[PDB]
Design a protein around this ligand. Structure first.
Ligand SMILES: Cc1cc2nc3c(=O)[nH]c(=O)nc-3n(C[C@H](O)[C@H](O)[C@H](O)COP(=O)(O)OP(=O)(O)OC[C@H]3O[C@@H](n4cnc5c(N)ncnc54)[C@H](O)[C@@H]3O)c2cc1C
Ligand SMILES: [Mg+2]
Length: 479
């Protein structure tokens, strides 16, 4: 097998079900498994908070450990991807560059640029899809060329397509004997960087640890303990294959003689992911409002202070602030916690663009996912997909049903930990003497509520009603 190959990890930070890396190994005599840490590209294309960096560095360290166990290595190269490639195609006499075929426009532009560079430097470019359950083009083809815009129509198309794609085989030590992974000269240049190298606090205090190893452990541990799986960061980073997880769930359904539906329900979660991936792959301007053909055009308020309070857990609604605090401190929050804060920010209370919430979630979520994040933010703002706009989450009462003593609030907002339960969700209703007894003066130690919920939601309902009465055709696209 003739090629000398660089495999570029972008997502797909895993050795199981990695079709591109497998294709690289099967076509090559020499391989350099590379992660390019390109601060300029990342600065131009995304927003990445400290917890996300920690999770990435952990996933890269794990990939390096796992590659090393097979007699290979991970090479982390810090630089601009085009200049890195020009240098190392020369250094290593590269004839093929492989990379996962991601659907995100910034990854597609990178891929386009690498293919142009290949035509110039003399390397072929090979990419395989490892991020989706289905061949997205086949879904579009069955739907007439456009993406299904409802989950119902999506499931109808999938029922014509059949089963998802199956995972490819695991990589073996024998793969790296047939296709050698040479130790480059100056191999210290290619170490996974430590947090200090990224100007980031050295201690990761998120209960999540990145990497394929932990993703697989969690995956197997969830199937043993059985609250959701908590696997989203691993799917978003590609430490875990959705095709592998889907098939694992099919295996359980098979061993239960088709009598266990909880694995089927969980497969449905992956199908929601596929739904948004499919819409996102074929919709112009998917991650913004303007120019987005499925998105209601809503004159959201430009109020950076309102956004600032929401982002920094200073809304004065403890349920909202506790959730935003968990997001900031841990990088993951439950699906319905995301509903609560996203509705509050957008159609419910603050009337701030879903684009701004999306960007905050992008910075803070370990599982930040281009397609999922935008699709769900359009959903939670009733900009597309969701149409029950008279239903607004109550930032006080929703948590009361869930957690009447406010243990979650007391955990994430310790300033409120001594508030009697009758005030824990609305501490501004306590008398000043009760505030003094709790050791927490509202407006000083914890803010007053930034809006009157009833007034704000009343006003926003009227605005949303006008939008939907005027933009009927756009609303109907996703109904
Ligand atoms: C405003 C908002 C923003 C969101 N942003 C993201 C994001 O950036 N990344 C992300 O992975 N999820 C996002 N979600 C979806 C959802 O909240 C998370 O996928 C889920 O909380 C992850 O927890 P889990 O892995 O335990 O999920 P499980 O219930 O165990 O689901 C298994 C997997 O299915 C997928 N999935 C589950 N729910 C959804 C959904 N509603 N839409 C699409 N895929 C889904 C995820 O890959 C998840 O890991 C967002 C939801 C909202 C409302
Ligand atoms: Mg679930």
């Amino acid at each position: 097998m003739p090629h000398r190959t660089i495999h570029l990890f972008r997502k797909g930070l895993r050795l199981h079900d990695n079709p591109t890396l497998l294709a690289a190994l099967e076509s090559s005599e020499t391989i350099y498994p590379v992660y390019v840490l390109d601060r300029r590209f990342l600065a131009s294309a995304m927003h990445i908070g400290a917890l996300r960096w920690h999770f990435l560095l952990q996933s890269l360290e794990d990939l390096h450990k796992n590659l090393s166990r097979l007699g290979a290595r991970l090479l982390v190269i810090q630089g601009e991807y085009e200049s890195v490639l020009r240098d190392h195609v020369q250094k290593w006499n590269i004839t093929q560059v492989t990379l996962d075929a991601e659907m995100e426009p910034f990854y597609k532009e990178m891929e386009a640029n690498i293919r142009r560079l290949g035509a110039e430097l003399g390397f072929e470019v090979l990419s395989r899809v490892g991020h989706s359950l289905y061949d997205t083009k086949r879904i579009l083809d069955l739907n007439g060329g456009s993406p299904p815009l409802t989950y119902k129509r999506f499931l109808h198309i999938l029922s014509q397509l059949g089963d998802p794609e199956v995972p490819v085989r695991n990589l073996t030590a024998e793969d790296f004997q047939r296709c050698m992974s040479p130790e480059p000269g100056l191999a210290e240049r290619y170490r996974v960087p430590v947090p200090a190298d990224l100007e980031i606090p050295p201690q990761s205090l998120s209960p999540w640890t990145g990497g394929e190893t932990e993703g697989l452990r969690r995956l197997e541990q969830h199937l043993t303990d059985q609250s959701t799986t908590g696997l989203s960061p691993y799917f978003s980073m590609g430490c875990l294959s959705v095709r592998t997880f889907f098939q694992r769930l099919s295996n359980i359904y098979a061993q239960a003689k088709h009598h266990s539906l909880p694995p089927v329900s969980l497969q449905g979660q992956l199908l929601w992911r596929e739904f948004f991936y499919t819409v996102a792959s074929a919709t112009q301007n998917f991650t913004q409002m303007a120019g987005n053909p499925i998105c209601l055009q809503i004159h959201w308020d430009e109020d950076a202070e309102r956004l600032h309070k929401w982002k920094t857990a200073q809304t004065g609604f403890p349920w909202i602030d506790a959730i935003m605090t968990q997001l900031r401190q841990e990088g993951w929050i439950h699906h319905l916690a995301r509903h609560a804060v996203a509705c509050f920010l957008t159609r419910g209370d603050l009337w701030i663009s879903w684009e701004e919430g999306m960007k905050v979630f992008e910075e803070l979520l370990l599982d930040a996912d281009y397609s999922i994040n935008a699709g769900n933010w359009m959903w939670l703002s009733a900009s597309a997909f969701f149409h029950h706009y008279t239903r607004i989450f109550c930032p006080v009462r929703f948590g009361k049903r869930t957690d009447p003593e406010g243990q979650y609030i007391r955990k994430y907002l310790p300033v409120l930990k001594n508030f009697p339960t009758k005030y824990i969700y609305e501490p501004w209703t306590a008398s000043e003497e009760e505030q003094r007894q709790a050791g927490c003066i509202i407006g000083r130690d914890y803010p007053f509520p930034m809006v009157n919920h009833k007034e704000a939601s009343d006003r926003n309902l009227q605005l949303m009603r006008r939008v939907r009465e005027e933009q009927r055709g756009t609303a109907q696209l996703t109904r």
